[PDB]
Design a binder for this molecule. Structure first.
Ligand SMILES: *[C@@H]1O[C@H](CO)[C@@H](O[C@@H]2O[C@H](CO)[C@@H](O[C@H]3O[C@H](CO)[C@@H](O)[C@H](O[C@H]4O[C@H](CO)[C@@H](O)[C@H](O)[C@@H]4O)[C@@H]3O)[C@H](O)[C@H]2NC(C)=O)[C@H](O)[C@H]1NC(C)=O
Ligand SMILES: *[C@@H]1O[C@H](CO)[C@@H](O[C@@H]2O[C@H](CO)[C@@H](O[C@H]3O[C@H](CO)[C@@H](O)[C@H](O[C@H]4O[C@H](CO)[C@@H](O)[C@H](O)[C@@H]4O)[C@@H]3O)[C@H](O)[C@H]2NC(C)=O)[C@H](O)[C@H]1NC(C)=O
Ligand SMILES: *[C@@H]1O[C@H](CO)[C@@H](O[C@@H]2O[C@H](CO)[C@@H](O[C@H]3O[C@H](CO)[C@@H](O)[C@H](O)[C@@H]3O)[C@H](O)[C@H]2NC(C)=O)[C@H](O)[C@H]1NC(C)=O
Ligand SMILES: *[C@@H]1O[C@H](CO)[C@@H](O[C@@H]2O[C@H](CO)[C@@H](O[C@H]3O[C@H](CO)[C@@H](O)[C@H](O)[C@@H]3O)[C@H](O)[C@H]2NC(C)=O)[C@H](O)[C@H]1NC(C)=O
Ligand code: CL
Ligand code: CL
Lengths: 426, 22, 426
């Protein structure tokens, strides 16, 4: 007569894209819409029981989360788990739920290994995956002739959830799975100056198509050094892997978009350097339902969560929890419609898998593997104004690259430089 | 390559390491 | 009035050095001695509750074990955990017990990361650690002039507990922490023939002091290829990291010791190759108490466990659980002796740490970090007979290398070859 939804997310830390202060009101919106829909679980009163994935220091934990999962499992015997979003929180919890035969929904956990659904059974991902990034990069190389070599520079802060590592893992494995070109990789520590000579050396020794996963400031500094060292767009192209657009303002206002601007008198030098740089991000959902969803999310978060949700790509994570939750409720309603129960985790999961759906994020497709296809945008600078704007969009489900607003991809040489230099790298 | 946690989630590609597999 | 001991080990799989078929009767011996000692917990009736660390497939699990730990924790509220031995099992469980404020004892979990007692609080290790292997290698290099460069080849079967990786990780980190020489490392896959051209090429390109962590057959084949490729003891030294002496028979009978013998007509070629090869192992305990312990362990395992315990280095693991358990009981008795309780996990742990003890394994020393110092033996072949015998022994507590039975380290050139070649590696 009622559905128990277990939640394991950061209930107190509001810094994560999947923090409760932001995923909570998105979920509450989803529940409220289930009530307003006589076609979604009519009569059921979906209850939620919460559990914090964060430890005593307030960061998502490989221990607090699995502990929270067992506690909710024996106290409330829920039908579905929501979250976690962090990789090292999600991996133990996912393995628990998999053993429990309980479905797991999350718009986080984008790591490669979560993709092994043979292990993370009944885990459905309705937000981004890092293999999907490899899909985009594959299509990008195929459409630009880079079929030999790329170099990937990544860095993480010690003790975090290693987001860049997992981003690069997914890109690396998927790209070599599909193209089998040489993908060199190097890890650095942003705060350590010893690495910058090394990186610059590796840049001009290991690749000309270069992907950097780092903070905005790290990527800016690396660009300034590459200009200082004479590395221009005629030979090098630097892709910042900034999937959440930390180096950009929101798509709602703040016209125009200038990541090289910093106010330290280096801005004139950074704009010249950034002529060789392009930013890879997730795609902002276009559909008006998204914008209406942002308005309600903001209203409900400031109301019942004392939190101020600001505009940005991070809002697709709570948008995807919202969508995935509705996607589940329909699946349950469908399973009930054929004599099943809310505990037929396999029947329910397979109903959600290999399926297209219409949510606040617009068209979303769950693949055969249980993972949402992920669309990506490519930002480039206008050589006239210097501001960055989307010039290329990737539809994850169709794996097509569509030019945006009739823009062209800026090249100092009129066409992309080759991924291998003249007479070798020497 | 070494020192990064003890979860199999962090051993799906190496990627810091020098391996002939993956 | 009674002490509840929680155990999380492989209760059904008898393949692990820390399997219950082998650690069970050793623990049984340890409890029986507690009963016979009026100075160890007089009146207490130490009870044991078991949990299997292995999954449905029967191998130690990163999921079954932490689930077992929570089950024992809420069902019996124990005062100490015993095991797990596998790294990926022990890591989640250790973090759980650390959060619970419950001491954890194990003769396994040798991985570098378990050594971070700031995280794995109240985890005391009474068996080998892989950093301790780094200590041995450090002393070895210091005593032989190799102060520049080594090469480390390692391989693991997919999906196992990655024992060679963790062995190499510990060796790698500790050695560079103390010597700061260049330690090159390469992973391979034993069954993949493509890797053998690569390894051989890397052997003669990346080092002359070479350590290999692999199966005996893998190490044999690599030696045959090295001899076939003209790599002799005058330039190269190959250390097999075989800590459990899988490539050797037991120290009890089976005289003499021939790892290159295989019965495939290649044995004549393998003996010549193995002249450049030395085997690093744990040290067999000398004390007569150890041998009397082996006799009782065999009798009790065949009796109440239907298991046949064969001679070998693996038996130090149950010996160490046995000793570790007695070491705890005394600590608890000491804590009780000063008004403490059995739940003063920090007081009990600190009584065990930085302490020397006498167990069936003889002298054992828990360092300031909660880790047993680990002694290593070095095996070398007699150029006359070809059989391998211990020629060097390493006391982990005093970090001294002592020649064994007046033997010398065999060198084709009279002295060890330099860890760097003539005019560079080119
Ligand atoms: C990224 O690529 C995806 C793969 O190509 C796109 O998916 C396509 O999305 C469209 C709609 O967004 C979808 O169209 C049809 O879907 C229904 C199922 O086949 C079909 O019944 C619909 O038809 C009905 O409605 C139309 C009016 O809309 C009527 O004219 C018809 O007579 C009928 O009554 C609808 O036409 C495609 O099926 C779907 N393709 C796949 C392969 O799933 C994504 O939309 C695209 N996303 C973006 C943002 O570009
Ligand atoms: C590896 O190196 C370790 C560090 O050097 C060795 O530890 C040493 O072990 C010995 C005994 O095995 C130990 O000796 C003394 O220990 C007691 C504590 O100080 C001390 O009270 C003892 O003295 C008594 O007994 C003797 C007879 O044995 C009498 O003559 C004395 O008058 C007294 O009544 C005992 O002598 C060392 O203290 C200890 N050193 C350290 C630094 O811990 C390991 O034994 C060694 N292992 C192997 C296998 O080589
Ligand atoms: C909310 O989560 C934030 C990110 O998860 C977190 O920020 C980070 O806080 C940690 C502390 O937990 C900082 O780092 C340190 O971690 C260990 C633990 O002490 C230290 O040993 C390390 O040396 C390191 O200094 C991170 O640097 C910091 N990162 C950022 C981007 O802020 C917040 O602190 C959390 N806030 C609350 C209220 O829980
Ligand atoms: C007792 O434990 C043994 C080692 O822990 C175990 O041996 C190993 O068994 C596994 C199967 O679990 C083999 O491997 C495979 O693992 C996955 C799971 O199916 C496969 O996808 C892989 O491709 C791989 O084939 C190991 O090869 C094998 N190793 C050895 C040295 O034997 C025993 O099977 C366990 N026995 C019992 C009764 O539980
Ligand atoms: Cl989380
Ligand atoms: Cl175990």
């Amino acid at each position: 007569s009622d559905l128990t939804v277990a939640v394991v997310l950061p209930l107190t830390n509001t810094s994560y894209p999947w923090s409760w202060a932001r995923v909570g009101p998105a979920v509450e919106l989803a529940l409220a819409r289930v009530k307003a829909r006589p076609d979604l679980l009519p009569g059921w009163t979906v209850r939620m029981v919460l559990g914090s994935s964060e430890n005593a220091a307030g960061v998502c934990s490989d221990t607090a989360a699995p502990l929270a999962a067992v506690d909710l499992k024996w106290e409330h015997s829920p039908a579905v788990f929501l979250g976690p979003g962090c990789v090292y929180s999600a991996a133990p919890v996912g393995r628990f739920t998999a053993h429990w035969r309980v479905p797991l929904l999350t718009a986080g956990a984008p790591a490669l290994g979560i993709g092994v659904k043979d292990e993370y059974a009944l885990t459905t991902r309705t937000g981004p995956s890092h293999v999907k990034l490899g899909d985009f990069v594959t299509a990008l190389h195929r459409r630009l002739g880079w079929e030999h070599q790329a170099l990937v520079l990544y860095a993480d802060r010690l003790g975090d959830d290693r987001p860049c590592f997992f981003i690069v893992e997914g890109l690396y494995m998927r790209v070599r799975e599909r193209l089998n070109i040489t993908v060199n990789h190097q890890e650095f520590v942003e705060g350590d100056p010893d690495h910058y000579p090394k990186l610059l050396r590796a840049v001009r020794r290991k690749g000309r198509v270069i992907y950097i996963c780092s903070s905005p400031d790290a990527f800016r500094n690396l660009m300034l050094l590459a200009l200082n060292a004479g590395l221009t767009g005629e030979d090098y192209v630097f892709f910042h892997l900034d999937v959440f657009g930390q180096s950009l303002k929101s798509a709602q206002g703040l016209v125009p978009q200038k990541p090289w601007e910093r106010g330290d008198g280096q801005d004139r030098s950074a704009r010249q350097a950034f002529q060789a740089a392009k930013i890879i991000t997730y795609k902002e959902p276009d559909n008006p339902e998204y914008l209406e969803f942002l308005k309600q999310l903001k209203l409900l978060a400031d109301k019942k969560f004392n939190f101020t949700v600001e505009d940005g790509l991070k809002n697709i994570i709570p948008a995807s929890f919202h969508d995935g939750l509705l996607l589940y409720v329909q699946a349950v309603t469908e399973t009930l419609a054929q004599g099943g129960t809310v505990t037929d985790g396999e029947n329910i999961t397979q109903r959600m898998w290999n399926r297209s759906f219409q949510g606040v994020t617009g068209y979303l497709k769950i693949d055969r593997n249980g993972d949402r296809d992920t669309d990506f945008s490519l930002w480039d600078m206008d050589p006239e104004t210097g501001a960055f704007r989307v010039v290329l969009n990737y539809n994850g489900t169709s794996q097509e690259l569509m030019a945006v607003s009739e823009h062209k991809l800026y090249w100092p040489l009129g066409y992309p430089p080759p991924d291998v230099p003249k007479c070798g790298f020497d | 390559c070494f020192g990064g946690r003890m979860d199999r989630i962090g051993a799906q590609s190496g990627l810091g390491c020098n391996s002939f597999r993956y």
